[PDB]
């Protein structure tokens, strides 16, 4: 009998089947269409690995050992519920359903409760790493049934990314906390990608760096404090040559990058729960504005943007490293908004997430994997109740040392009419969070004028209204 079952063989579950078999476990498999079930065992016997193939979902359910554990990697839709309903027919008490797809967390909380209304235990697990992380080591974020995580952890611990000793797996928490963490993960991924793209345009359009020089600076930044998966791949991307022309491949890609849904979700949670995430607002704005490509062409023909002529006595020494410090400053700020949202929702949902180990599971396999997340993990284990992360003593010293660089990057781009909303929002976010008095006294005074919303006073309690 098999140890684990896996429904849904895309480019993501296939390689997870190979990983599970590569680590001493052997897996059962089912797909709606059987050509991909055909292709998977093809690659299994190629790599000298055994994977059992099945045509109906019933034969594989009966070919697992109790408690039966099944993983789903099918796309979000009614298909998730037609699989889960039909798995429930054959499943009995104590059996485990593990959803690995990126699903809206409210959907999971609904399905955890329907499935335990049959005492079928549900594990909503977010997976990150793509199809490289699948095959060799991803970042697992399982949440929901603590019982189900305990019976399957051993499969996850040896199939995840190993940072030294540490497997990139941890019990996230109860309910749909697994999808919420993974959702916040791609929110921080969207912001990291936007900040990198804005650093790319500062060097190319102010220091007027060619595409290879940009690849070197990213290969030099990747050697450092911002050593990350995304920074290293930009160095590779910027150096890549097209095979149809003699140009760099990135320069021939049309600048339309829409939102694929997941990352969009984090801004909805931010808005409705009242937790600001400005770095992510700029990231979604950049993606959404790019979609109107033929409106932006008409707009530029009316508002022609001139080539960037830099002042001859503008000083640009250390600007490459000021952008270094600025980018690192904006990443500290970007994670601060993400983890503050996680912390707050953790308290409202009563999940009591451990952000120290969430940072530690994210050190490998995922898209945002960086040495930076080891500083975060060490920060929260030093202070387990830290709300904002740059309030940590080391991080606060990093902000105070590198914030002038962020000011000068925003100043230089502002003067030369280069838009970097993520950089501007990140420094705007810091200046408002760290200010005791904000101009919302005038707003509260305005609302009382026309709407009688009442206001509160500095020196006394109670709500007051005045005829101005």
Binding residues: 8-13, 31-33, 36, 74-76, 102, 128-130, 185-186, 190, 260, 287, 447, 453
Residue in the block written with tokens 């501007």: 424
Closest CB to ligand NAP among residues 83, 325: 83
- By the rule CB under 8 A, 200 interacts with a copy of itself: yes
Residues 126/181, Cβ–Cβ less than 8 Å: yes
- Alpha carbon distance 459, 322 (integer Å): 43
Closest CB to ligand NAP among residues 10, 388: 10
- By the rule CB under 6 A, 183 interacts with ligand NAP: no
Rounded least distance, CB 167 to a copy of itself, Å: 21
- By the rule CB under 6 A, 24 interacts with ligand NAP: no
Rounded least distance, CB 32 to a copy of itself, Å: 21
Interface with ligand NAP in residues 317-336 (CB under 6 A): none
Closest CB to ligand NAP among residues 102, 211: 102
- Alpha carbon distance 402, 322 (integer Å): 8
Q: Has 189 been annotated as catalytic?
A: yes
Rounded least distance, CB 317 to a copy of itself, Å: 19
From residue 228 to residue 267, the character string flagging contacts with a copy of itself as x (rule: CB under 8 A) and all else as - is: -xx--xx-xxx-x---xx---xxxxxxxxxxxx---x--x
- By the rule CB under 8 A, 297 interacts with a copy of itself: yes
The one segment of 26-34, 331-339, 374-382, 434-442 that binds ligand NAP by CB under 6 A = 26-34
Q: Which residues contact 299 (CB under 8 A, 6 or more apart)?
A: none
With both helix axes pointing from N to C terminus, report the angle between 293-302 and 278-291 in degrees, rounded to the nearest 10: 90
- By the rule CB under 6 A, 388 interacts with ligand NAP: no
Q: Has 39 been annotated as catalytic?
A: no
- By the rule CB under 6 A, 31 interacts with ligand NAP: yes
Q: Per the annotation, where are the binding residues for NADP(+)?
A: 8-13, 31-33, 36, 74-76, 102
- Alpha carbon distance 134, 185 (integer Å): 17
Contacting residue, 4, 5, 8, 365, with ligand NAP by CB under 6 A? 8
Name the DSSP letter for residue 101.
S
Q: Give buried/exposed letters for 391-404 (b at 16+ CB in 10 A, else e).
A: ebeebeebbeebbe
Backbone φ and ψ for 162, nearest 5 degrees, come out as: -95, 115
Rounded least distance, CB 412 to a copy of itself, Å: 10
CA distances from 327 to 8, 222, 417, 424, 450 (A): 39, 12, 19, 11, 43
Start-to-end C-alpha separation, the chain? 79
The CA-based diameter of the chain, rounded to the nearest angstrom, is 83
Closest CB to ligand NAP among residues 59, 251: 59
Q: Are strands 166-167 and 162-163 parallel, antiparallel or unpaired?
A: antiparallel
- By the rule CB under 6 A, 84 interacts with ligand NAP: no
- Please pick, among 103, 109, 121, 189, the residue that the annotation labels catalytic: 189
Binding footprint of ligand NAP, residue count (CB under 6 A)? 12
Residues 356/384, Cβ–Cβ less than 8 Å: yes
- Alpha carbon distance 407, 431 (integer Å): 11
Contacting residue, 164, 312, 451, 462, with a copy of itself by CB under 8 A? 451
- Alpha carbon distance 302, 186 (integer Å): 36
Per CB under 6 A, residues contacting ligand NAP are 8-11, 31-33, 36, 74-75, 77, 79
């Amino acid at each position: 009998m098999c140890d684990i079952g896996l429904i849904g063989l895309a480019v993501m579950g296939q390689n997870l089947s190979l990983n599970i078999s590569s680590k001493g476990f052997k897996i059962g498999v089912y797909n709606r269409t059987y050509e991909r079930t055909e292709e998977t065992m093809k690659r299994a016997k190629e790599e000298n690995l055994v994977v059992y193939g099945y045509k109906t979902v019933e034969e594989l359910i009966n070919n697992l050992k109790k408690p039966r554990k099944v993983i789903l990697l099918i796309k979000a839709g009614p298909a998730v519920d037609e699989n889960i309903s039909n798995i429930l027919k054959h499943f009995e008490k104590g059996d485990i359903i593990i959803d690995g797809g990126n699903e809206w967390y409210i959907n999971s909380e609904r399905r955890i409760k329907l499935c335990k209304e049959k005492d079928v235990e549900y594990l909503a697990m977010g997976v990150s790493g793509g199809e490289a992380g699948a095959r060799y080591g991803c970042s697992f974020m399982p949440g929901g049934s603590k019982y189900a995580y305990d019976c399957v952890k051993e499969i996850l611990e040896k199939c995840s990314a190993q940072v030294g000793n540490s497997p990139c797996v941890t019990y996230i928490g109860p309910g749909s906390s697994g999808n919420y963490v993974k959702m916040v993960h791609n929110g921080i991924e969207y912001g990291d990608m936007q900040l990198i793209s804005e650093s790319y345009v500062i060097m190319k359009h102010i220091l007027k760096y060619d595409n290879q020089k940009l690849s070197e600076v990213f290969n030099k930044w990747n050697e450092g404090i911002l050593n990350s998966y995304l920074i290293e791949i930009t160095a590779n991307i910027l150096a890549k040559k097209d095979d149809l022309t003699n140009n760099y491949l990135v320069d021939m890609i049309l600048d339309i990058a829409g939102a694929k849904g997941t990352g969009k979700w984090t801004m909805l949670e931010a808005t409705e729960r009242g937790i600001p995430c400005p770095t992510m607002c700029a990231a979604l704005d950049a993606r959404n504005i790019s979609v109107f490509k033929e409106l932006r062409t008409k707009a530029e023909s009316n508002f022609n943007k001139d080539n960037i002529l830099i002042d001859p006595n503008e000083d640009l020494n250390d600007f490459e490293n000021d952008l270094l410090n600025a980018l690192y400053c904006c990443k500290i700020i970007s994670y601060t908004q993400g983890l503050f949202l996680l912390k707050q929702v953790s308290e409202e949902m009563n999940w009591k997430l451990n952000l120290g180990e969430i940072a530690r599971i994210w050190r490998g396999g995922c898209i945002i994997r960086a040495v930076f997340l080891d500083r975060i993990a060490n920060a929260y284990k030093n202070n387990e109740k830290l709300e904002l992360l740059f309030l940590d003593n080391e991080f606060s010293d990093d902000i105070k040392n590198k914030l002038p660089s962020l000011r000068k990057i925003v100043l230089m781009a502002t003067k030369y009419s280069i838009p970097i909303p993520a950089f501007s929002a990140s420094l705007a976010y810091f200046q408002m969070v760290t200010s005791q008095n904000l101009p919302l006294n005038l707003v509260q005074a305005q609302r009382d004028y026309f709407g009688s919303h009442t206001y509160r006073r500095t020196d006394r309690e109670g709500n007051y209204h005045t005829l101005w």
